[PDB]
Amino acid sequence: HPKLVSSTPAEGSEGAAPAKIELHFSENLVTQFSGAKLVMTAMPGMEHSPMAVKAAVSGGGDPKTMVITPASPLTAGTYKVDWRAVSSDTHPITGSVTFKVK
């Protein structure tokens, strides 16, 4: 209803890498305390513990429209987008989306 209404992040997407990660909220939040990052949680060679990966966080022409780009070409493996959105009146929403790549 209010808060996050639509996104195209990569909700359990498998196969080709997700193009970008879009987050859209009914509410005009983002009081200078929102952001998002990407971590890889399976990658070849290692299968070592989940670790921070290279993403760039942007927004559209609205502060309430978050747009996260991967900065490296996402290769075969599994990743987690962690996003954290905050409002003026506090009300943190902190959340995550996992996806896979081949």
Curated annotation (Swiss-Prot):
<feature type="binding site">
    <location>
        <position position="43"/>
    </location>
    <ligand>
        <name>Cu(+)</name>
    </ligand>
</feature>
<feature type="binding site">
    <location>
        <position position="46"/>
    </location>
    <ligand>
        <name>Cu(+)</name>
    </ligand>
</feature>
<keyword id="KW-0479">Metal-binding</keyword>
<dbReference type="GO" id="GO:0006825">
    <property type="term" value="P:copper ion transport"/>
</dbReference>
<feature type="binding site">
    <location>
        <position position="51"/>
    </location>
    <ligand>
        <name>Cu(+)</name>
    </ligand>
</feature>
<comment type="subunit">
    <text>Monomer.</text>
</comment>
<keyword id="KW-0614">Plasmid</keyword>
<feature type="binding site">
    <location>
        <position position="48"/>
    </location>
    <ligand>
        <name>Cu(+)</name>
    </ligand>
</feature>
<feature type="binding site">
    <location>
        <position position="1"/>
    </location>
    <ligand>
        <name>Cu(2+)</name>
    </ligand>
</feature>
<feature type="binding site">
    <location>
        <position position="40"/>
    </location>
    <ligand>
        <name>Cu(+)</name>
    </ligand>
</feature>
<comment type="function">
    <text>Copper-binding protein involved in copper resistance and homeostasis. Probably mediates copper resistance by sequestering the excess of copper in the periplasm. May act as a copper carrier in the oxidizing periplasmic space that exchanges either Cu(I) or Cu(II) with its putative partners CopA, CopB and CopD.</text>
</comment>
<dbReference type="GO" id="GO:0046688">
    <property type="term" value="P:response to copper ion"/>
</dbReference>
<keyword id="KW-0732">Signal</keyword>
<dbReference type="GO" id="GO:0005507">
    <property type="term" value="F:copper ion binding"/>
</dbReference>
<feature type="binding site">
    <location>
        <position position="91"/>
    </location>
    <ligand>
        <name>Cu(2+)</name>
    </ligand>
</feature>
<protein>
    <recommendedName>
        <fullName>Copper resistance protein C</fullName>
    </recommendedName>
</protein>
<comment type="similarity">
    <text>Belongs to the CopC family.</text>
</comment>
<dbReference type="GO" id="GO:0042597">
    <property type="term" value="C:periplasmic space"/>
</dbReference>
<keyword id="KW-0574">Periplasm</keyword>
<keyword id="KW-0186">Copper</keyword>
<dbReference type="GO" id="GO:0005886">
    <property type="term" value="C:plasma membrane"/>
</dbReference>
